[PDB]
């Protein structure tokens, strides 16, 4: 009774405790496998701040549970939530500013796919620029592996 009442409370805790970590690894989207003053000054420097602490939290995600495959065999939350609602509010702001209003997310997909079509991989520069044989040889090695797999 009281026993199951403490179970009630710790089950509530485990509820919000699974809701703890990033929605990113809560929709199990792919985490990069290897973690290895005028208005302009403030914007650029604090944007680089965002980059640094995103690297921090990503290595935090690594440090927690990194994969359960055969290869391998600070803040509290609602403060970040207040930050997130500030985000979405001023998101509506810069939405209404840079008009974009009526036009549709599918033509937005058209733009994304069109641009990231011409973004090509320079491995000699480890970058995307506005090469192909590297991508094909990766495809060929993946097919080599898949082939021997299906072969056994």
């Amino acid at each position: 009774d009281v026993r199951a009442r403490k179970a009630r409370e710790e089950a509530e805790r485990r509820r919000i405790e699974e809701l703890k970590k990033s929605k990113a690894l809560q929709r199990q989207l792919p985490r990069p496998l290897n973690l290895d003053a005028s208005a302009e000054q403030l914007r650029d420097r604090a944007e680089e701040l965002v980059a640094a602490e995103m690297r921090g939290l990503l290595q935090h995600d690594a440090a927690k549970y990194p994969v359960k495959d055969g290869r391998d065999a600070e803040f509290e939350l609602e403060a970040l939530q207040s930050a997130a609602e500030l985000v979405d509010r001023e998101v509506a702001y810069l939405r209404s500013a840079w008009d974009h209003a009526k036009l549709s997310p599918d033509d937005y997909s058209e733009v994304w796919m069109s641009v990231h079509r011409d973004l090509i991989y320079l491995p000699s520069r480890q970058r995307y620029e506005r090469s192909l044989k590297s991508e094909f040889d990766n495809v060929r090695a993946d097919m080599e592996r898949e082939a021997k797999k299906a072969a056994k």
């Binding site: 192909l132 044989k133 094909f136 495809v139 060929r140 993946d142 097919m143 898949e146 082939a147 797999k149 299906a150």
Partner: protein, 51 residues
């Protein structure tokens, strides 16, 4: 010969539309072997009593 899944040769290397042809064959055979392994896994998982 196309099945051996080869990228553009010497006289075809420099031209990139040949690497478009290589995209065709390489991607096609990639998903070939993928749905292949899918069918094989599907039967060895399931097919026994069907046979």
């Amino acid at each position: 010969v196309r099945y051996r899944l080869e990228p553009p040769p010497q006289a075809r290397r420099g031209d990139v539309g040949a690497w478009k042809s290589s995209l065709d064959n390489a991607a096609a055979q990639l998903e070939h072997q993928h749905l292949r392994i899918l069918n094989q896994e599907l039967l060895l998982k399931y097919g026994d009593k069907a046979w």
